[PDB]
């Protein structure tokens, strides 16, 4: 009976994957624009009084945990202000290196925030004034915000996985920054497969992967994992 509507279930799961990727792409896109705008505006006049005033504005401080500018001399400005660890250097941080490596904006993987000590991600971009970089701007979003975004939509759940197979954001915090192989050792889903049927705790799940279109610099996927019996029962 299943083998007759199995192509049907594929169609629903692909649809659910697409919708989820679309939403995330949309939620991130406005935040990417604010950081880009901040960087465009800094490049206007990169005097440090100006920078501070821009990063203090409510549109940025209500949207990000903090935003900041770092330069090639090692200096930085962060708003809201925070006590940084001794010897903190913005140049070595994943937002800075990421932004300098790309011709456009970028998004980090999860990393440990120097300010709060919590796992976050960052949107970052180089502020270019007339072709020349003047530093890197970024904004921090917490993993909990990202987890909350994903879990909005009883078959299953969504998670965010990079195109290298590293889980970035998953409702089970234990699996954050684990590869697929490490998180699903017994029976590993493969991105190369439209659908991967895997056993988790003696139950079959169906896992697909949907690319998130329209992100700058990164190729990430939405993963969907659904209980096979619940999915078919539907
Ligand atoms: C000023 C940079 C901030 C603190 C960034 N979240 C970092 O951890 O590097």
TrEMBL record:
It comes from the Bacteria. It is found in: Cell inner membrane. Signal peptide: none annotated. Coiled coil: none annotated. Belongs to the methyl-accepting chemotaxis (MCP) protein family. This is Putative methyl-accepting chemotaxis protein. It comes from Pseudomonas fluorescens (strain Pf0-1). The lineage of its organism: Bacteria, Pseudomonadati, Pseudomonadota, Gammaproteobacteria, Pseudomonadales. The chain holds residues 34 to 270 of 629 of the full protein.
């Amino acid at each position: 009976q299943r083998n007759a509507i199995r192509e049907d279930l594929d169609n629903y799961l692909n649809e659910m994957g697409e919708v989820t990727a679309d939403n995330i792409q949309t939620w991130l896109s406005g935040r990417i624009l604010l950081i880009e705008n901040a960087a465009q505006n800094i490049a206007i006049n990169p005097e440090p009084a100006a920078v501070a005033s821009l990063l203090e504005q409510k549109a940025l401080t209500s949207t990000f945990m903090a935003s900041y500018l770092g330069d090639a001399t090692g200096h930085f400005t962060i708003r809201p202000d925070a006590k940084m660890p001794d010897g903190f250097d913005p140049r070595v941080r994943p937002w800075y290196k990421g932004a300098e490596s790309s011709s456009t904006s970028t998004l980090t993987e999860p990393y440990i925030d120097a300010a709060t000590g919590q796992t976050i991600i960052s949107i970052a971009t180089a502020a270019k004034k007339a072709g020349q970089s003047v530093g890197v701007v970024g904004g921090d979003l917490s993993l909990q915000t990202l987890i909350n975004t994903l879990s909005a939509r009883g078959m299953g759940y969504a998670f965010l996985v990079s195109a290298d197979g590293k889980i970035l954001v998953h409702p089970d915090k234990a699996l954050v920054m684990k590869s697929l192989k490490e998180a699903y050792p017994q029976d590993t889903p493969r991105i190369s497969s439209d659908f991967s049927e895997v056993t988790v705790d003696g139950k079959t799940r169906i896992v697909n992967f949907t690319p998130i279109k329209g992100l700058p610099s990164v190729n990430w996927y939405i993963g969907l994992s659904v209980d096979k019996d619940k999915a078919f029962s539907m």
